[PDB]
Sequence to fold (230 residues):
Amino acid sequence: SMSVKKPKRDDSKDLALCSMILTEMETHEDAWPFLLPVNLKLVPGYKKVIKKPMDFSTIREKLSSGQYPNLETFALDVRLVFDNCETFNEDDSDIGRAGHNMRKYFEKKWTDTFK
Amino acid sequence: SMSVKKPKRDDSKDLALCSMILTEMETHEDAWPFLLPVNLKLVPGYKKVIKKPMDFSTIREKLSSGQYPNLETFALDVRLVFDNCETFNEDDSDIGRAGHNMRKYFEKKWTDTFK
Ligand SMILES: N/C(=N/O)c1ccc(F)cc1
Ligand SMILES: N/C(=N/O)c1ccc(F)cc1
Fold:
């Protein structure tokens, strides 16, 4: 609270580390469903169903332009990518499996980097 | 944003300084309408009209128990006291004038202490 602070965590490397993790996500062989935004004019249902579209290239543009105020908000967008994927894809499909794989991939990198 | 911070303002004295200012408010001769919470069972209209009652003793209890996370939230409660006063009192009344006087009194102390 006021004048009562926890010891300051050094966050000076967070931006670089998030960029690193995002690069690993981007280069994963199962990243292809998530690299670019879904074309809302070509994919039936997506615009009405998915209230907050997100993809790696958008995350990258936000990261590169200071639109994440902290670690937590970066992770939220990354997880949003896979939450959307689950909403729109059967688990038993190529894209469904990709999402599950990439989520697991992210969460371990996330833990190994900060936890 | 992430890994981009303004120079750290030293906030270690804010709690003591807010307490000091609150003490000056409390001891002002026109503090009497604001020292204690309005009795909602004895004052017609107040409970239905004033959605967020606030008074100095409540501010003091919050301050003393770490319920203000920062300067801004302390000032918000103080100003709420006088906003409520304006809502429920004619400017041309003793309590109305008290509120205006105490608000001016606060805002100068506030500026002189932090600005
Ligand atoms: N099930 C799909 N197969 O291509 C699919 C196509 C486009 C999408 F945006 C999501 C899923
Ligand atoms: N006008 C008033 N006179 O006592 C007044 C009384 C009680 C209040 F809570 C506010 C105002």
Q: What stands out?
A: Residues 1-115 of chain B form a domain with the Histone Acetyltransferase; Chain A fold (CATH 1.20.920.10).
